Design a protein around this ligand. Structure first.
Ligand SMILES: NC(=O)c1ccc[n+]([C@@H]2O[C@H](COP(=O)([O-])OP(=O)(O)OC[C@H]3O[C@@H](n4cnc5c(N)ncnc54)[C@H](OP(=O)(O)O)[C@@H]3O)[C@@H](O)[C@H]2O)c1
Length: 325
């Protein structure tokens, strides 16, 4: 079915999405300039045709540089590459949506993005700080209006600036808000959420499948485990006994097992690596398949514990993780 050369899966709007992509978030202060560009180039050389980025990752210009270089040399055409960008919390006022997308297009120096998603359902105070905090370290929120923000997203697709629209970190209630919107023109085609064997998203996945929404698994390898924002209560995913045991069977790493697990169930995976060897490693997931019993045993590792909890924002009205799913 899925192969290195052909692994795009249908989106509900008639477009398609490569089932593996390269994630591109990297801690700004601890990442060498140019590392993102180099990695995107290597990924495309390797066979990746999907890149996940965001303006607030501070390296979207590197992503564009790499994609454009690969198009220029004839490695790919624009239509062969799938780029996903994201609308951050401080940019949710409807009037800001299109100008925010336009900034990202200018930064990439591209005519359109393949997928543009609401990055979190929470709105923060508009301004120059992506993380609005006052003197008392307090977070400066803003009142969310998801349906209104969505209408502004819809207009962006109408203008030809983006092929597909989606969301990220949305729970069932927030999804329904958009799906049940009076006059809905473009339904969300994708919800990007934390997903891996320690947090398998059983209910949210079923709900999304009901509405023909594809799940994209962010932190599909269990995160970089940066204590600053990652919940390190759970042991390292890639050190899991079962995942490693199954790895021996296929002569694959635990990483390869966990990526195969999600793509085999129709979940898009966007592992980040800026390492030459690991970029290649993560892509070698089309030359084996897991048995049904193996799939069952992997799913059974589910802990219902998130590596990405975002506790700082539990008090925002649109915090997505209070609900069961
Ligand atoms: N929408 C959201 O709110 C949201 C949230 C989190 C992440 N994301 C997106 O999802 C992408 C993926 O998630 P993430 O970066 O948090 O985490 P991740 O992809 O689960 O894990 C990345 C960490 O794993 C390492 N790694 C990669 N391949 C490896 C391999 N084969 N073996 C051992 N270690 C490996 C990376 O280091 P090296 O680079 O040194 O290989 C890095 O430290 C992001 O980069 C971003 O594009 C979106």
């Amino acid at each position: 079915d899925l192969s290195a050369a052909s692994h795009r899966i249908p989106l509900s709007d008639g477009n398609s999405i490569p089932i593996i992509g390269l994630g591109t978030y990297s801690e700004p202060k601890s990442t060498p300039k140019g590392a993102c560009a180099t990695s995107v180039k290597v990924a495309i050389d390797t066979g990746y045709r999907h890149i996940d980025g965001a303006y607030i990752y501070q390296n979207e210009h590197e992503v564009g540089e790499a994609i454009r270089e690969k198009i220029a040399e004839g490695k790919v055409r624009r239509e062969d590459i799938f780029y996903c960008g994201k609308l951050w919390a401080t940019n949710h006022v409807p009037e800001m949506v299109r100008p925010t997308l336009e900034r990202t297009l200018r930064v990439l120096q591209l005519d359109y993005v393949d997928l543009y998603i609401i990055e979190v359902p929470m709105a923060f105070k508009p301004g120059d700080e992506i993380y609005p905090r006052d003197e008392n370290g307090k977070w400066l929120y803003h009142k969310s209006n998801l349906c209104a923000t969505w209408e502004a997203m819809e207009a962006c697709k109408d203008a030809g600036l983006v092929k597909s629209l989606g969301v990220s970190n949305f729970n069932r209630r927030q999804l329904e808000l958009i799906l049940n919107k009076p006059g809905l023109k473009h339904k969300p085609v994708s919800n990007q959420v934390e997903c891996h064997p320690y947090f398998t998203q059983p209910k949210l996945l079923k709900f999304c499948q009901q509405h023909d929404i594809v799940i994209t698994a962010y932190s599909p390898l269990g995160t970089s485990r940066n204590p600053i924002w990652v919940n390190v209560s759970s042991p390292p995913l890639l050190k899991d006994a079962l995942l490693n045991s199954l790895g021996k069977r296929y002569n694959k790493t635990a990483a390869q097992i966990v990526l195969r697990f999600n793509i085999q169930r129709g979940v898009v995976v966007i592992p980040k690596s800026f390492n030459l060897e690991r970029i290649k490693e993560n892509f070698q997931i089309f030359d084996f398949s897991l048995t049904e019993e193996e799939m069952k045993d992997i799913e059974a590792l589910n802990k219902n514990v998130r590596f990405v909890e975002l506790l700082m924002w539990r008090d925002h009205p649109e915090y997505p993780f209070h609900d069961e799913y």
